[PDB]
């Protein structure tokens, strides 16, 4: 029974077998891997990618659909032509022996045959051949979820506890969260809502089991981590996205969470889809988001090094020179200040918000945009930085060269903002500042913030299950010796001095075999030494895609002299340049 | 500096990247949105840009016959991608000439939806694939500039305007380059063009760019994957390019070691020509009769 | 940041909750008018429900104690026998509405209600509408209980629309039944068959299960046709219920009312394709197919007028539809434009190269090769299926301009090319415009009379766009005298006697139906006459109506160019060339006049049944002054209830204003110069082209969505007009429940719930039923469509909703809701507050004897509209101002209606409430229906209900009230020395219809209430006179009936026929 599959978003096509990417745990046991026969051939993604520039959405499907599964050859110089289960990327006839696989997620836009999905799905719902990914596991295909005969209690259904980089496993766990278990131990029915694309090692390392009513209030960090990296949370069953809350939000506050089943556990590829450069990447999360639980809380729970806190440039670091300065720029306006505040909280907008925003937006242009343009190399030149803004206007008004990934968090930030103790001013001063930091957003779809946390803190979740020690290799630039001494400085023994621009952790001596001493030079590297710190600017910008997979670079890396004892007296100021290699 | 920004509750939910304007918000932003969406829904249903000679004309406008600038290269920016560029068969003389960029990647009509790494280092001056991604932005701006030489369309005029019958106000906009931003102007434009480009056939590829699908989350009770047209696919990459500003790899030879990487929202084509008439059309008809 | 902000912050915190639990949140009208983008994805109709079709979980509420030291053997749990009990055995076993609690079948619908048991709060299923931000967290809104109950039942009757499906009926080899083939599974096997339980000791469960008849279990009579294949339907008895079965049976009746046999489906496909697409069906019995594909035409006319409402009324609507049709039209046509033939027939007219003006050069000049691929011919052909919407106006730039006589040769050819490309445009006033162009071109020699003042003969011809300003000489050529205008009478004679008479042809099938609003069903109109499609080799003919129209305007402009006022100015040699060009133009062997009369109707009648939008046409009318369609207008509001009974239809209806500008010189080239391949069989070339468009059943998606937009327009006309007081002709079984906010703002919040329920239950993602709440008033939402001709004859076409099915499913839920409200935690009757210091048992919900003091009784005085209290001085008790406004004293019996108590709980709680618990006065709380909450308690202990009741008054606002709390003793299994408790709140009518059983495990209830398992809910199990059927549905909800398990197979289009 053939099964057509149109690849899901961030589909891993390289370094992972199709079975690993189209719902892994198909490839867990050998009693369940051998029943599948993948037909996703190598030429077909290169044969059909050249033709989809003109073939029509419908037209391509009709030409493509009629075809046998093991095809024959064709023509002069041999261009190949355009078991129990037969997985295939070719959309077949969708008959009684052909089931369309539905993975409850958006299809990618890199695949050329992904236009065929709204036509194949509508043809599948008029029959019943709309297969969920859990039905690939059991012995008989049923197009439905939790069927009559099979109480899904086999070990393959748990979807947990399972070089080796740039391709993390990912679950879309649906978790029932009951309310207060009051009234003689009987529990109110509560609700269930799925959290899409949670990385599996974030659940495995925190010892989360697939069926145990865990406490929730304490939020706990393991749910707050799984909400942060998690791509989206959607009411279970139907596609409505719902923002959770953490504060004293409403009654019945979801005291207990339990992960129930794991709908679609697959491996996605996060090579360089949000972050593009190996320099610095910022997020434009709103004011009351949860920046403090992935900067330090997630690396506090581990003993390795996902971060380095000298970078990780937080938002309101331009308060480091403002909150009591914006507040001192409106104590004069009375009722349109108080009246104005209500409008941000309420659905509608009034005229009092205009005289508060234009008191802010005339104030932001005078103080912070100088204080952000003066903060240039801390943002993008610290080796590897990570930043945090309130808007993309915050880092584009000052001409700061960083990729500005926008960010939406699946936790409602305003109701977290109103339970903010000990803040400057009141809590209502935050909401005046939050709406002022929201209207300069510039209407760009907010990319889900979990998509970036599943790439920076993504592969570092995979580290405690490697069962192999890590091998540090360093991207290192080399200073000529007399350039230091010709600036008032003194160096020892007059040898070329090497500064490690970026560290990285290969796992099996793979990067070294080919990568070492290969001198990739497309991004040139220029180090500047000043009174106590050195900044590194890559003049051809070092892209994250050129970094081979399984390299694992740590977030927020600061630049260190490879022999810091060689320098004597830290004399002078000066900027040199270098080409760099790995070692 | 904007004294009246669009509020963030005036847009719809996102549809992949760009957002639509709500019908409620009137003002000068609504007339800009309505004059651009109505022109985009005229370009998307047209037989003119499907002729092969009109394609070869449009590829001839991108490699500049006159002008150009010191663009850096492509394969130091295609290490983001997988596509390796052409190299000299024989000793090569031209260095990164706009023409060469065309020469570097001409395998898939001067572009390839395998080349989505057009957003890495733009506008290199102290790109032929960003000029070709900006196809439907100056296709619509050449419909707004329908009514639009000096010897007979200016010299005769200047004279008629100067005669002491008719008094004449001359309107010169200072920094019309640095006023087109994605915070107000360039988001209404890319919002309106992506709305007008639905009256075309939604599976029609344009200029070698296919017809991908999109998230479409503009209704909170039903987000659904929707196949957008070919011209809308350029708008999703224009909105991912206009919002990140324009890179500038300025390395002046006057100052010695001055090498840079500069992002801003200014372009050194005819849109800040095209926005002039429609924004004065709203002045004389709606704004100035409202209060003077 | 003071009190002004602080209240908002606190208010905001409470009114946040709709971002969590409710999938459908009424009226967050961010996107009210939502565009019907041409990507209708279709709904999911076929969901199996392999579990047991029930929706009322028998819930083990308060559990029986595991007492082990003292008094052993009173309780007998089935857990000690390693077995699960079919009936719950706690000390109280409530029945509750928990939808799809035992639905372990395929998939899930979503949008399912689940009432918590009455020990919990259960006021979060009645805050679905009119309760966010008005009310707080722990209250229910009594002024809008009817609107919230009706939406709660609408989620009940939508989450149950599944198809029953049989599992594997294995035999039962164990000794409990011996060979009775039950439906085997893995936990709800002993729980779905209560007659199959091993009964150890005589429990309170077991003395009801011992009366279970032993042949009311398992399958009954499976009706399989083909031996060896899967069965058709199997009748079986198991734990279902009569209410959920009827919703699940009226949905299979819905699917059988949109499925036709394989000899019917094939005919429909052939009719749609005009009999060329070749498909065969195997004449052999397929025993089980269900193809829910074909809606009737009365529902399809509703989907069409819905898709004209939620779309922009202007020019934006016409373009997608026309372009989409145009793309198909150009794609499958045999006709290939090739303008070299027109070029080689013009440029080979020998003119002289000594005149300064070359006539030949001029005609070629205007006719251009601008890159146009002549889609303006196909945007003028495809704009004939939508001439009610878009009308093709001649472009304003392409007229021969004024200040230019007929001597001007570029302004002479523009008058010719306007005439040839006259009737290709579907514009009502085009004929006048074509005539006007020439009459304004020579307005010096030939003066005619323009019928109105305000314009003259030398007016630009583009302004002649109203029907009244047609010149009377053109309406009647006898008024033009040939002594003055010999040339302009001949044009008005030529237009009135050569313009093509409109005709008609059929499209689609008459079995499937058609969404034609104004034309008769499955008929299309056409501005030229038509002939059937030929199967022979075709050649260009000259006896068509188009080639006659071409060869008469050319023969007219020859007479123009050889007139007397033309031969005076132009040289006599160049008019030989101008006569030479035109006479070489009428003789071009063009295929396009054969294409319009023959191939293009069969081209149009196939594409009109494969498009995403069916053709909306209005009747064509050439040349008639009184019957020009000025407006085609569609209404979304019933004007009889708006007061607008007799105003004109241009006011009560919304007019379409679309106008595609087309160019003559891009049409005249395609008109005069199309050709085809020589060996062209037109029937073969369409069957080679229409075969991919009929390849699969995605054509029946527009057909399948029209059932839902029928069945969601009725439930948004029912639920709106059933909430508010006396609307349409909808029955109101929910009418005792109080509804006060009947405003137009509340009616939009109910329709936005019914819209968001159907958008979630079926998962269809277009813009179904969202068009109406555009004017803000959805309580008069009725669809209509009409067109007003200039004579005044307006064809009003009412479109009513079809005979829906979920109309009479929701009318069956609310009919049985009023007898079984206690299963949904609503209660009937009132609420008393007398002091009762009982030592024995207490039962608030089920009161014995007569209630004391019903309203209107002797000495029972009603509190006034304010509830105000006048204090009396110096040692008199403060009186209470009563209904008759004369201050009676508190010590007595009062009727305190809930609206008065909602605005007086600071006067109730201080004055008349201390006279309740002092045993002095006895109030009545006259509230109609309410949610109740049952706080149980250990009876052998001190317990006062006064802190519970004082808590209940503290949460009462002018907004809503919290659910009424009742203290009920836990029924003990032994006689107990009970403390005397002081209770207060007890209801009036017997609201204890949900106590399924009490302390079922025990051997006997010895104190509280021995409300044992009533065999009126179970007569399928424990009754001798029970028959199959006999679902006494309106009166009570059964719990064990004989249902049907269908075993359908849903094939594709390739599973029915063979298409090649």
- Intra-chain end-to-end CA distance of chain C, in Å: 75
Chain C: nearest CA to B241, how far in angstroms? 27
Question: Does A445 lie in the same domain as A492?
Answer: no
Which two three-digit tokens encode residue C915?
């006279």
CA angle C494, C500, C502 (to 5 degrees): 145
Contact of A230 with chain B, judged by CB distance below 8 Å, is answered with no
Which residue is listed with tokens 């429990």?
A: C203
HSE toward the beta carbon, residue C59, CA cutoff 13 A? 27
Which two three-digit tokens encode residue B38?
């109505």
Contact of A565 with chain C, judged by CB distance below 8 Å, is answered with no
Contact of A58 with chain B, judged by CB distance below 8 Å, is answered with yes
Kindly determine whether residue B221 and residue C327, on different chains, have CB atoms separated by under 8 Å: no
Which of C753, C656, C804 has the alpha carbon at shortest distance from C129?
C753
Question: Does A237 lie in the same domain as A158?
Answer: yes
Question: Does A316 lie in the same domain as A242?
Answer: no
HSE toward the beta carbon, residue A534, CA cutoff 13 A? 25
SS3 category, A441: coil
With CA atoms as reference, the chain B residue closest to A351 would be: B4
Helices and strands, counts by H and E, chain B: 9, 6
Which residue is listed with tokens 């506050």?
A: A253
Query: What is the distance between the alpha carbons of residues C753 and C128, in angstroms, rounded to a whole number?
Result: 8
Contact of C24 with chain B, judged by CB distance below 8 Å, is answered with yes
Q: Exposed, middle or buried: residue B163 (CB in 10 Å: 0-12, 13-18, 19+)?
A: exposed
Question: Does A291 lie in the same domain as A370?
Answer: yes
Kindly determine whether residue A126 and residue C50, on different chains, have CB atoms separated by under 8 Å: no
Kindly determine whether residue C319 and residue B53, on different chains, have CB atoms separated by under 8 Å: no
Technique employed here was cryo-EM
Query: What is the distance between the alpha carbons of residues C354 and C347, in angstroms, rounded to a whole number?
Result: 16
Question: Does A424 lie in the same domain as A283?
Answer: yes
Query: What is the distance between the alpha carbons of residues C248 and C161, in angstroms, rounded to a whole number?
Result: 6
Kindly determine whether residue C105 and residue A148, on different chains, have CB atoms separated by under 8 Å: yes
Which two three-digit tokens encode residue C122?
């259960």
Residues of B in contact with C33 (CB under 8 A): 23
Closest CB from B3, B16, B227 relative to A358: B3
With CA atoms as reference, the chain B residue closest to C30 would be: B12
Closest CB from C28, C33, C323 relative to B199: C323
What pairing do the DSSP bridges indicate for beta strands A256-267 and A214-215? antiparallel
Chain A: nearest CA to B172, how far in angstroms? 25
Closest CB from A118, A403, A441 relative to B244: A403
Kindly determine whether residue C104 and residue A146, on different chains, have CB atoms separated by under 8 Å: yes
Sequence-distant (≥ 6) Cβ neighbours of residue A535 within 8 angstroms: A377, A381, A382, A527, A528, A559
Treating both helix axes as pointing N-terminal to C-terminal, what angle do A352-373 and A335-345 enclose, rounded to 10 degrees?
90
Sequence-distant (≥ 6) Cβ neighbours of residue A418 within 8 angstroms: A247, A427, A430, A431, C9, C12, C13
The full set of domain ranges for chain C reads 40-1060
Residues of C in contact with A177 (CB under 8 A): none
Query: What element of type H or E holds A256?
Result: strand A256-267
Q: Are A338 and C4 in contact (CB under 8 A)?
A: yes
Chain A: nearest CA to C60, how far in angstroms? 9
Which two three-digit tokens encode residue B59?
């590829």
Which residue is listed with tokens 């039923």?
A: C769
Q: Rounded to whole angstroms, what are the CA distances from B254 to A538, C494, C664?
A: 22, 79, 60
Q: Are C97 and C113 in contact (CB under 8 A)?
A: yes
In C763-859 the beta strands, taken as DSSP E runs, fall at 784-789, 797-798, 826-827, 831-836
- Intra-chain end-to-end CA distance of chain A, in Å: 51
Question: Does A297 lie in the same domain as A210?
Answer: no
Contact of B16 with chain C, judged by CB distance below 8 Å, is answered with no
Q: Exposed, middle or buried: residue A417 (CB in 10 Å: 0-12, 13-18, 19+)?
A: buried
Closest CB from A52, A117, A404 relative to B213: A117
Beta partners for residue A313, in sequence order:
A387
Question: Does A503 lie in the same domain as A424?
Answer: no
Resolution (A): 3.8
Question: Does A392 lie in the same domain as A289?
Answer: yes
Q: Rounded to whole angstroms, what are the CA distances from C220 to A181, C183, C213?
A: 43, 11, 14
Which two three-digit tokens encode residue A251?
């009654």
Kindly determine whether residue B45 and residue C319, on different chains, have CB atoms separated by under 8 Å: yes
The DSSP secondary structure of C869-897, one letter per residue, reads: EE--SSS-PPEE-BTTSS-B-SSSEEEEE
Treating both helix axes as pointing N-terminal to C-terminal, what angle do B271-282 and B135-144 enclose, rounded to 10 degrees?
40
Contact of B8 with chain C, judged by CB distance below 8 Å, is answered with no
| Three-state secondary structure of A478-491 | EECHHHHHCCCCEE
Q: Are C110 and C759 in contact (CB under 8 A)?
A: no
SS3 category, C980: coil
Task: Give me the total of CB pairs closer than 8 Å, taking one residue from chain A and one from chain B.
Answer: 139
Rg value, chain C, Cα: 40
Query: What is the distance between the alpha carbons of residues A154 and A138, in angstroms, rounded to a whole number?
Result: 9
Beta partners for residue A382, in sequence order:
A536
SS3 category, C786: strand
Chain B: nearest CA to A181, how far in angstroms? 30
CA dihedral angle for residue C753, residue C758, residue C760, residue C766, rounded to 10 degrees: -110
Question: Does A475 lie in the same domain as A449?
Answer: no
CA angle A536, A542, A547 (to 5 degrees): 120
- Domain range spanning residue A350? 269-467
With CA atoms as reference, the chain B residue closest to C42 would be: B224
The DSSP secondary structure of A193-238, one letter per residue, reads: EEEEEEEHHHHHTTT--SS--EE-----HHHHHHHHSSSEEEESSS
Which of C139, C27, B19, C127 has the alpha carbon at shortest distance from A347?
C27
With CA atoms as reference, the chain A residue closest to B114 would be: A110
Residues of A in contact with B112 (CB under 8 A): 53
Query: What is the distance between the alpha carbons of residues C982 and C980, in angstroms, rounded to a whole number?
Result: 7
Which of C116, C115, C101 has the alpha carbon at shortest distance from C188?
C101
Which alpha helices (DSSP H) does C608-724 contain, by range? 649-652, 665-672, 682-687, 702-711, 715-723
Report the sign of the C-alpha dihedral through residues A349, A350, A352, A354, in that order.
positive
Which two three-digit tokens encode residue A136?
């690939």
Q: Are A475 and A582 in contact (CB under 8 A)?
A: yes
Q: Are A128 and A14 in contact (CB under 8 A)?
A: no
Closest CB from A57, A117, A444 relative to B225: A117
Query: What is the distance between the alpha carbons of residues B253 and B242, in angstroms, rounded to a whole number?
Result: 29
Sequence-distant (≥ 6) Cβ neighbours of residue C966 within 8 angstroms: C844, C845, C932, C933, C934, C935, C985, C986, C987
With CA atoms as reference, the chain A residue closest to C64 would be: A184
Question: Does A229 lie in the same domain as A312?
Answer: no
Sequence-distant (≥ 6) Cβ neighbours of residue B163 within 8 angstroms: none
Q: Are C398 and C420 in contact (CB under 8 A)?
A: no
Rg value, chain A, Cα: 27
Indicate the length of chain A as a whole number.
Answer: 583
Which two three-digit tokens encode residue A321?
């020179």
Which residue is listed with tokens 């008849």?
A: C213
Suggest the residue from A53, A350, A435, A536 to mutate for an interface test with chain B (most B CBs closer than 10 A): A53
| CA C902 remoteness from chain centre | 38
CA dihedral angle for residue C996, residue C999, residue C1000, residue C1004, rounded to 10 degrees: -120
Kindly determine whether residue B222 and residue C39, on different chains, have CB atoms separated by under 8 Å: no
Count of beta carbons in the 10 Å neighbourhood of residue B55: 15
Treating both helix axes as pointing N-terminal to C-terminal, what angle do A428-436 and A352-373 enclose, rounded to 10 degrees?
70
Question: Does A219 lie in the same domain as A340?
Answer: no
Contact of B113 with chain C, judged by CB distance below 8 Å, is answered with no
Which two three-digit tokens encode residue A483?
């350039």
Closest CB from B116, B183, B203 relative to A57: B203
Sequence-distant (≥ 6) Cβ neighbours of residue A349 within 8 angstroms: A343, B7, B9
CA angle A303, A304, A310 (to 5 degrees): 100
- Give the phi and the psi of residue C552 in degrees, each rounded to 5: -120, -30
Interface of A with C in 73-112 (CB under 8 A): 93-96
Chain B: nearest CA to C600, how far in angstroms? 21
With CA atoms as reference, the chain A residue closest to B245 would be: A396
SS3 category, C12: helix
Q: Are C466 and C432 in contact (CB under 8 A)?
A: no
CA angle A49, A50, A56 (to 5 degrees): 80
Question: Does A296 lie in the same domain as A246?
Answer: no
Chain B: nearest CA to C778, how far in angstroms? 20
Q: Are A475 and A553 in contact (CB under 8 A)?
A: no
Query: What is the distance between the alpha carbons of residues C1012 and C758, in angstroms, rounded to a whole number?
Result: 41
Which of B205, A54, B50 has the alpha carbon at shortest distance from C370?
B50
Kindly determine whether residue A338 and residue C5, on different chains, have CB atoms separated by under 8 Å: yes
HSE toward the beta carbon, residue B197, CA cutoff 13 A? 28
Residues of A in contact with B114 (CB under 8 A): 49
With CA atoms as reference, the chain C residue closest to B20 would be: C31
Rg value, chain B, Cα: 21
Q: Are B140 and B200 in contact (CB under 8 A)?
A: no
- In our burial notation (b when 16+ CB lie closer than 10 A, e otherwise), range C520-552 reads ebbbbbbbbbbeebeeeebebeeebbbbebbbb
Q: Are A274 and A544 in contact (CB under 8 A)?
A: no
Count of beta carbons in the 10 Å neighbourhood of residue C561: 22
Which residue is listed with tokens 């209660």?
A: C827
Chains linked to B by 3 or more Cβ pairs within 8 Å: A, C
In B110-260 the beta strands, taken as DSSP E runs, fall at 213-214, 226-227, 246-248
Q: Are A377 and A558 in contact (CB under 8 A)?
A: no
HSE toward the beta carbon, residue C532, CA cutoff 13 A? 6
Residues of B in contact with C30 (CB under 8 A): 9, 12, 22, 220
| Three-state secondary structure of C798-817 | ECCCCCCCCHHHHHHHHHHH
Suggest the residue from A96, A238, A251, A339 to mutate for an interface test with chain C (most C CBs closer than 10 A): A238
Sequence-distant (≥ 6) Cβ neighbours of residue C411 within 8 angstroms: C400, C401, C404, C405, C441
Which two three-digit tokens encode residue C630?
């000025």
What pairing do the DSSP bridges indicate for beta strands A490-491 and A567-568? antiparallel
Kindly determine whether residue C765 and residue B48, on different chains, have CB atoms separated by under 8 Å: no
Which alpha helices (DSSP H) does B118-270 contain, by range? 135-144, 155-162, 185-196, 230-242
Which two three-digit tokens encode residue B267?
């372009």
Kindly determine whether residue A444 and residue B222, on different chains, have CB atoms separated by under 8 Å: no
Count of beta carbons in the 10 Å neighbourhood of residue A135: 20
Contact of C38 with chain B, judged by CB distance below 8 Å, is answered with yes
């Amino acid at each position: 029974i053939t099964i057509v599959v149109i690849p899901t978003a961030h589909f891993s096509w390289t370094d992972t077998n199709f079975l690993n990417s189209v719902d892994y745990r198909l490839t867990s046991q050998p009693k369940i891997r051998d029943r599948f026969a993948v037909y996703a051939p190598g030429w077909l993604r290169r044969q059909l990618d050249e033709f989809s520039a003109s073939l029509t959405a419908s037209e391509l499907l009709q030409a493509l659909q009629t075809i046998p599964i093991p095809v024959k050859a064709r023509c002069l110089l041999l261009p190949k032509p355009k078991r129990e289960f037969c997985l295939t990327i070719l959309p077949s006839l969708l008959g009684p022996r052909t089931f369309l696989l539905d993975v409850d997620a958006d299809r990618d836009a890199s695949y050329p045959l992904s236009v065929l999905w709204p036509q194949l799905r509508a043809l599948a719902l008029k029959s019943r051949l709309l297969l969920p990914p859990v039905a690939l596991l059991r012995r008989v295909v049923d197009p439905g979820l939790k069927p009559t005969w099979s109480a899904d209690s086999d070990a393959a259904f748990r979807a947990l506890r399972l070089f080796d980089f740039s391709a993390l496993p990912v679950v879309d766990i649906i978790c029932l969260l009951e309310s207060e278990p009051d009234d003689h131990g009987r529990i109110a029915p509560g609700t269930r809502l799925t959290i899409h694309s949670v990385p599996t090692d974030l659940l495995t390392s925190l010892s989360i089991q697939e069926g145990v009513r865990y406490p929730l209030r304490q939020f706990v960090h393991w749910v707050l981590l799984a909400l942060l990296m998690s791509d989206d949370v959607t009411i279970s069953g139907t596609r409505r996205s719902v923002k959770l809350e953490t504060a004293h939000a409403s009654a019945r506050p979801f005291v207990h969470i339990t992960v129930e089943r794991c709908a679609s556990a697959r491996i996605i590829d996060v090579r360089g889809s949000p972050a593009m450069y190996a320099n610095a990447v910022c997020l434009t999360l709103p004011k009351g988001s949860y920046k403090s639980t992935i900067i330090d809380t997630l690396p506090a729970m581990f003993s390795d090094l996902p971060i380095l806190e000298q970078a990780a440039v937080i938002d309101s670091d331009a308060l480091g020179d403002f909150l009591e300065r914006l507040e001192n720029l409106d104590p004069n306006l009375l009722d349109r200040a108080v009246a104005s505040i209500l409008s941000p909280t309420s659905d509608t907008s009034d005229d009092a918000v205009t005289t508060v925003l234009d008191a802010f937006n005339a104030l932001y242009r005078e103080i912070m945009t100088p204080a952000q343009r003066a903060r240039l190399p801390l943002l993008t030149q610290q080796g590897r930085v990570l930043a945090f803004a309130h808007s993309d206007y915050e880092l584009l008004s000052a001409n700061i060269p960083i990729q500005v990934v926008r960010g939406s968090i699946p936790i409602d930030h305003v109701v977290n903002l109103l339970a903010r103790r000990n803040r400057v001013g009141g809590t209502a001063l935050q909401v005046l500042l939050d709406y002022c930091y929201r209207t300069q957003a510039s209407p760009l779809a907010p990319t889900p913030a979990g998509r970036l946390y599943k790439q920076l803190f993504g592969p570092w979740l995979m580290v405690p299950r490697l069962s192999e020690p890590l091998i540090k290799l360093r991207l290192v630039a080399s200073a000529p010796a007399k350039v230091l001494r010709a600036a008032g400085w003194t160096i020892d023994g007059d040898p070329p001095l090497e500064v490690s621009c970026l560290c990285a952790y290969v796992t099996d001596r793979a990067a070294a075999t080919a990568l070492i001493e290969r001198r990739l030079d497309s991004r040139a590297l220029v180090t500047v030494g000043g009174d106590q710190l050195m900044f590194v600017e890559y003049a051809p910008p070092l892209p994250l895609v050129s970094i081979p997979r399984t390299f694992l670079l740590p977030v927020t890396y600061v630049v260190h002299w490879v022999p810091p004892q060689r320098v004597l007296l830290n004399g002078g100021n000066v900027s040199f340049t270098s080409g760099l290699e790995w070692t | 500096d904007i004294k009246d920004p669009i509020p963030p509750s005036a847009w719809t939910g996102p549809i992949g990247n760009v957002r639509y304007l709500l019908p409620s918000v009137q003002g000068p932003a609504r007339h800009l949105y309505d004059t651009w969406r109505a022109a985009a829904r005229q370009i998307a249903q047209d037989p003119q840009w499907h002729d092969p000679l009109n394609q070869a004309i449009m590829r001839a406008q991108y490699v500049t016959a006159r002008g150009g600038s010191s663009a850096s290269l492509k394969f130091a920016l295609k290490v983001t991608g997988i596509v390796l560029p052409e190299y000299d068969d024989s000793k090569v003389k031209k260095s990164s000439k706009i023409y060469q960029a065309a020469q570097i990647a001409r395998i898939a009509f001067m572009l390839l939806i395998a080349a989505i790494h057009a957003e890495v280092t733009m506008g290199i001056r102290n790109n032929v694939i960003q000029q070709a991604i900006s196809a439907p932005h100056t296709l619509v701006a050449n419909y707004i500039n329908k009514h639009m030489v000096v010897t007979d369309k200016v010299i005769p005029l200047i004279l008629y305007a100067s005669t002491p019958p008719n008094t004449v106000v001359n309107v010169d906009i200072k920094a019309c380059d640095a006023s087109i931003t994605y915070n107000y102007f360039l988001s209404v434009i890319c919002g309106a063009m992506h709305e007008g480009f639905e009256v075309g056939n939604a599976d029609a590829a344009f200029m070698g760019v296919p017809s991908t699908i999109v998230s479409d989350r503009r209704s909170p009770v039903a987000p659904y994957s929707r196949p957008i047209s070919g011209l809308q696919t350029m708008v999703q990459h224009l909105a991912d390019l206009y919002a990140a500003g324009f890179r500038y790899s300025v390395s002046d030879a006057f100052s010695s070691g001055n090498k840079f990487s500069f992002p801003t929202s200014t372009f050194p084509s005819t849109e800040h020509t095209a926005n002039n008439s429609t924004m004065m059309e709203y002045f004389l008809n709606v704004h100035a009769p409202s209060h003077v | 940041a003071t009190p002004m902000i602080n209240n908002a912050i606190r208010s905001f915190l409470t009114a946040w909750d709709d971002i969590r639990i409710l999938s459908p949140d009424v009226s967050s009208k961010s996107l009210s008018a939502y565009l019907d983008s041409a990507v209708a994805n279709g709904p999911e109709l076929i969901i199996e429900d392999t579990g047991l079709c029930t929706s009322f979980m028998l819930l083990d509420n308060i559990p029986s104690a595991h007492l082990t030291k003292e008094l052993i053997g009173f309780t007998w749990f089935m857990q000690m026998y390693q077995m699960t009990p079919p009936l719950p055995e706690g000390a109280v076993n409530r029945i509750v509405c928990m939808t799809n609690w035992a639905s372990l079948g395929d998939e899930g619908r979503g949008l399912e209600v689940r009432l918590p048991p009455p020990t919990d709060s259960s006021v979060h299923a009645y805050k679905t509408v009119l309760s966010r931000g008005y009310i707080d967290n722990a209250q229910f809104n009594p002024l809008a209980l009817r609107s919230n109950v009706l939406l709660m039942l609408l989620q009940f009757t939508l989450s149950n629309l599944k198809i029953n499906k049989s599992s594997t009926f294995t035999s039962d080899v164990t000794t409990i039944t011996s060979g009775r083939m039950i439906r085997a599974f893995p936990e709800l096997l002993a729980l779905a068959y209560p007659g199959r339980a091993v009964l150890p000791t005589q429990t309170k469960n077991a003395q009801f299960l011992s009366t279970a008849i032993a042949d009311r279990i398992g399958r009954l009579d499976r009706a399989n046709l083909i031996g060896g294949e899967v069965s058709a339907m199997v009748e079986c008895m198991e734990l279902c219920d009569a209410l959920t079965l009827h919703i699940r049976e009226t949905y299979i009746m819905l699917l059988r009312s949109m499925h036709q046999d394989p000899t019917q489906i094939v005919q429909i496909v052939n009719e749609c394709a005009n009999n060329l697409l070749n498909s065969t069906i195997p004449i052999s019995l397929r025993p089980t197919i269900l193809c829910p594909w074909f809606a009737s035409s009365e529902d399809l006319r509703l989907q069409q007028v819905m898709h004209l409402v939620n779309i922009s009324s202007n020019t934006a609507a016409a373009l997608p539809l026309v372009e989409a049709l145009s793309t198909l039209l150009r794609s499958v046509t045999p006709l290939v434009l090739d303008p070299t033939v027109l070029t080689n027939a013009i440029t080979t007219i020998s003119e002289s190269t000594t005149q300064t003006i070359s006539p030949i050069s001029e005609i070629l000049r205007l006719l251009q090769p601008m890159g146009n691929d002549y889609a303006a011919f196909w945007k003028c052909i495809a704009s004939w299926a939508y001439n009610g919407l878009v009308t093709t106006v001649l472009s304003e730039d392409a007229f021969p301009d004024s200040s230019q006589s007929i001597t001007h040769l570029p302004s002479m050819w523009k008058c010719l090319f306007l005439t040839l490309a006259g009737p290709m445009t579907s514009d009502p006033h085009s004929p006048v415009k074509v005539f006007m162009a020439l009459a304004n071109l020579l307005a010096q020699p030939e003066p005619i009379a323009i019928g109105v003042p305000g314009m003259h003969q030398t007016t630009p011809a583009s302004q002649f766009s109203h029907p009244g300003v047609w010149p009377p000489g053109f309406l009647n050529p006898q008024l033009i005298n040939p002594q003055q205008a010999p040339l302009l009478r001949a044009f008005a004679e030529h237009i009135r006697a050569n313009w093509p008479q409109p005709s008609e042809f059929g499209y689609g099938s008459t079995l499937q139906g058609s969404a034609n609003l104004f034309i008769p069903s499955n008929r299309m109109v056409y501005p030229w006459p038509n002939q059937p499609l030929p199967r022979l080799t075709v050649a260009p003919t000259y006896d068509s109506a188009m080639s006659n129209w071409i060869s008469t305007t050319i023969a007219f402009f020859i007479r123009v160019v050889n007139s007397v006022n033309m031969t005076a100015t132009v040289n006599d040699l160049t008019r030989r060339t101008m006569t030479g060009v035109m006479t070489a133009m009428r003789q071009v062997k063009t295929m396009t006049p054969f294409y319009i009369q023959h191939m293009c109707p069969t081209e149009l009648s196939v594409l009109a049944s494969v498009t995403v939008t069916p053709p909306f046409q209005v009747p064509f009318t050439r040349l008639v002054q009184n019957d020009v369609i000025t407006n085609v207008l569609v209404a979304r509001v019933d004007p009889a209830q708006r007061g607008d009974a007799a105003v004109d239809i241009r006011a009560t209806h919304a007019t379409f204003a679309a106008a595609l500008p087309v160019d003559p010189a891009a049409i005249v080239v395609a008109m005069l110069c199309g050709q085809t391949e020589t060996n062209l069989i037109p029937s073969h070339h369409y069957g080679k082209a229409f075969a991919p468009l009929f390849a699969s059943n995605a054509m029946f998606t527009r057909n399948q969505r029209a059932v839902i937009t029928r069945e969601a327009f009725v439930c948004a006309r029912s639920a709106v007009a059933q909430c508010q007081d006396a609307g349409f002709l909808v029955p109101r079984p929910l009418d005792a429940l109080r509804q006060f906010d009947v405003t137009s703002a509340a009616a939009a919040e109910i329709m936005h719930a019914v819209n968001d329920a159907f958008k979630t239950a079926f998962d269809l993602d277009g813009a179904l039923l969202d068009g109406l709440a555009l004017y803000g008033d959805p309580r008069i939402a009725d669809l209509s469509a009409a067109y007003l001709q200039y004579g005044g004859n307006v064809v009003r076409e009412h479109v009513p909703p079809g005979p829906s099915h979920i109309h009479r499913a929701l009318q069956q839920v609310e009919s049985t809701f009023m007898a079984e409200m206690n299963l949904f935690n609503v209660a009937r009757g009132n609420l008393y507050l007398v002091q009762t210091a009982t030592n024995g048992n207490w039962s608030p919900m089920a009161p014995v004897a007569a209630p004391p003091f019903v309203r209107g009784g002797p000495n029972v005085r009603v509190v006034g509209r304010f509830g105000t209290i006048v204090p009396r001085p110096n040692g008199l008790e403060p009186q209470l101002i009563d209904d008759g406004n004369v201050p009676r004293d508190i010590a007595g019996d009062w009727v305190y209606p809930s609206d008065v108590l909602q605005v007086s709980v600071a006067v109730f709680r201080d004055y008349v409430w201390p006279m309740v618990k002092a045993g002095r006065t006895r109030v009545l709380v006259e509230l109609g229906h309410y949610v109740y909450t049952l706080h149980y308690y250990d009876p052998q202990i001190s317990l006062d209900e006064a802190p519970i009741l004082e808590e209940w008054l503290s949460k009462i606002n002018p907004a809503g009230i919290p659910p009424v709390p009742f203290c009920i003793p836990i029924p003990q299994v032994y006689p107990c020395i009970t403390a005397r408790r002081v209770h207060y709140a007890f209801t009036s009518e017997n609201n204890n219809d949900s106590l399924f059983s009490t302390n079922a495990a025990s051997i006997d209830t010895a104190f509280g209430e021995n409300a044992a398992v009533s065999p009126l809910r179970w007569p399928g199990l424990v009754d001798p006179n029970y028959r199959v059927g006999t679902n006494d549905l309106p009166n009570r909800i059964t719990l064990y009936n004989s249902l049907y398990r269908y075993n359908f197979t849903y094939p594709t289009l390739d599973g029915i026929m063979y298409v090649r």
